[PDB]
C-alpha cells in the first residue's frame, strides 16, 4: 500500500459525513508532498497528514493503523524516511485549529503505553481510548471523532 492509498482510505469517512470537501484527499496529498509529516517517536512511526485552506467544514480526526510499516518522508529532514504504523489524518478548518491538535498529538505520541495499545487494540477499543482522551482536553473536545474514523490498513 502507498501513502496515496492511506490518505484516500482515511479521508473516505470524513468525506461521507461532509466534514471535508469531496476532493479533500487531493489537497492532503499535495500538502504531504510539499511538507512531509513523518515522525519517529520511541520505536513507532507516526504520520500526521493534513491540509491548509478552506477544504474543511468541521474539525475532525481520522486514525489509521497499518499492519506493516509504509514509508513516509520525515517531518524533519534526514535520509532513510520514517517507517510509519499509525496515521493521524487531521481535518482542520484553519491553521490555528491544526496547531491545537498538534499540541495534543505530541503528548499522545510521547505517551509510550498509549501508542502501543493503538498497535494492538481493536478498532472499537481504539475509538473508546482516543475518544476518552479527547473528552479530557477542553481545547479540543468539540472535534469530530466517530467509530467510523478508525481503520486498520
Amino acid at each position, epitope marked *: 500500500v502507498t501513502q496515496e492509498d492511506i490518505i484516500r482510505a482515511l479521508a473516505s469517512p470524513l*468525506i*461521507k*459525513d*461532509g466534514m471535508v*470537501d*469531496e*476532493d479533500f484527499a*487531493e*489537497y492532503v496529498i499535495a500538502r504531504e508532498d510539499r511538507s512531509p509529516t513523518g515522525l519517529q517517536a520511541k520505536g513507532v512511526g507516526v504520520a500526521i497528514p493534513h491540509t491548509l*485552506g*478552506d477544504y474543511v*467544514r468541521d474539525n475532525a480526526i481520522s486514525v489509521g493503523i497499518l499492519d506493516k510499516p509504509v514509508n513516509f518522508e520525515g517531518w524533519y529532514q534526514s535520509p532513510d524516511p520514517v517507517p510509519v504504523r499509525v496515521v493521524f489524518m487531521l481535518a482542520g478548518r484553519t491553521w490555528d485549529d491544526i496547531v491545537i491538535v498538534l499540541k495534543w498529538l505530541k503528548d499522545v505520541i510521547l505517551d509510550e503505553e498509549f501508542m502501543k495499545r493503538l498497535l494492538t487494540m481493536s478498532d472499537e477499543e481504539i475509538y473508546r481510548q482516543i475518544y476518552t482522551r479527547i473528552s479530557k482536553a477542553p481545547q479540543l473536545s468539540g472535534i469530530n471523532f466517530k467509530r467510523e474514523y478508525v481503520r486498520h490498513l
Partner: antibody, heavy 131, light 108 residues
Framework: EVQLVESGGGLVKPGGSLRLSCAAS????????MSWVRQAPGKGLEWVGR??????????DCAAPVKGRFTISRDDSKNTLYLQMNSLKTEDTAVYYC??????????????????????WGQGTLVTVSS | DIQMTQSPASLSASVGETVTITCRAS??????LAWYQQKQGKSPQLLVY???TLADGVPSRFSGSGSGTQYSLKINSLQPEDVGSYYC?????????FGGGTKLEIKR
C-alpha cells in the same frame, strides 16, 4: 431567465487596482457557487477563482498566478459577485467572465456542492492593463 | 496540478466529416472532464460534462468519450457553422485546468 451581467472592466495602469462586478438574476444567488474565468486576447480559457455560498463557508480559492493579488467576494443582498484586482500587470489583460458552477447533491453527507463546469456564462468584460 | 494537453491545436476539415479532438490528462481524472465550444465574439457554451453526458440543447452529433487520462470529443457530420474553438476542462479540483484549445477550420 438566468442572466449574468458583468461590468467594471476598462483601462487601468500597471500596478493599479480595479474591481469587477457580476449582477446575477433568474436563480437563487445565495445558494450558488460562483467563479471567474479569463481569456487573454487570442488565447485560451483560464480559471481564475471560486467563491462558495454562505452555508458552505463563503470562502474563496484562486489560481496560483493571481493568489495574493486578487480577491473574490459576494454580496447576496445585491446578488452580485466581485473580483478585486490589485497590483495589476500587463499579463492580466483579458476578457473576464463570471460563471455559475453546477450543483451536485451529496447523498451521504446531505450537503449540496459545486462542480466547476459552467453552463451559464456572463457576457464578459475586458480589462486592459496599459500605460 | 493536473495538466491538460489538447490536440490538435488547429484542425481543418471538410463538411460532413467526423472530427475528433483529444485531451490527455497528466493524471487519472476519472471522467471529471467538460467540453466547451466558443464562437467568435461569444462566450463559451458547455457541450459535454462527465466526459460523456451531452448538455441541454446540444445537437446529438456531438459526443464525448474516454476514461483514465485519455478523452475525445467527436463531431459527426461537420457543418459550416461548427467553425470556432473547442476546449476541454478538468473540473474535479484546483486549478480546474482548461486545455489549450482547438481551432476548427472548414475546408471548402
Amino acid at each position: 431567465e438566468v442572466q449574468l451581467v458583468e461590468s467594471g472592466g476598462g483601462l487601468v495602469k500597471p500596478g493599479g487596482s480595479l474591481r469587477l462586478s457580476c449582477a446575477a438574476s433568474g436563480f437563487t444567488f445565495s445558494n450558488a457557487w460562483m467563479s471567474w474565468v479569463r481569456q487573454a486576447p487570442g488565447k485560451g480559457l483560464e480559471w481564475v477563482g471560486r467563491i462558495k455560498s454562505k452555508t458552505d463557508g463563503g470562502t474563496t480559492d484562486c489560481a496560483a498566478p493571481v493568489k495574493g493579488r486578487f480577491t473574490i467576494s459576494r454580496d447576496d443582498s445585491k446578488n452580485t459577485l466581485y473580483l478585486q484586482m490589485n497590483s495589476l500587470k500587463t499579463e492580466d489583460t483579458a476578457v473576464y467572465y463570471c460563471t455559475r458552477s453546477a450543483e451536485f447533491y451529496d447523498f451521504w453527507s446531505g450537503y449540496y456542492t459545486g462542480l466547476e463546469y459552467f453552463q451559464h456564462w456572463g457576457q464578459g468584460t475586458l480589462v486592459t492593463v496599459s500605460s | 496540478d493536473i495538466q491538460m494537453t489538447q490536440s490538435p491545436a488547429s484542425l481543418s476539415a471538410s463538411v460532413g466529416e467526423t472530427v475528433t479532438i483529444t485531451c490527455r490528462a497528466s493524471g487519472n481524472i476519472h471522467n471529471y472532464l467538460a467540453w466547451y465550444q466558443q464562437k467568435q465574439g461569444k462566450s463559451p457554451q458547455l457541450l459535454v460534462y462527465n466526459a460523456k453526458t451531452l448538455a441541454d440543447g446540444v445537437p446529438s452529433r456531438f459526443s464525448g468519450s474516454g476514461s483514465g487520462t485519455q478523452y475525445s470529443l467527436k463531431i459527426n457530420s461537420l457543418q459550416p457553422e461548427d467553425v470556432g474553438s473547442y476546449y476541454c476542462q478538468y473540473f474535479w479540483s484546483i486549478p480546474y485546468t482548461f486545455g489549450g484549445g482547438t481551432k476548427l477550420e472548414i475546408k471548402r
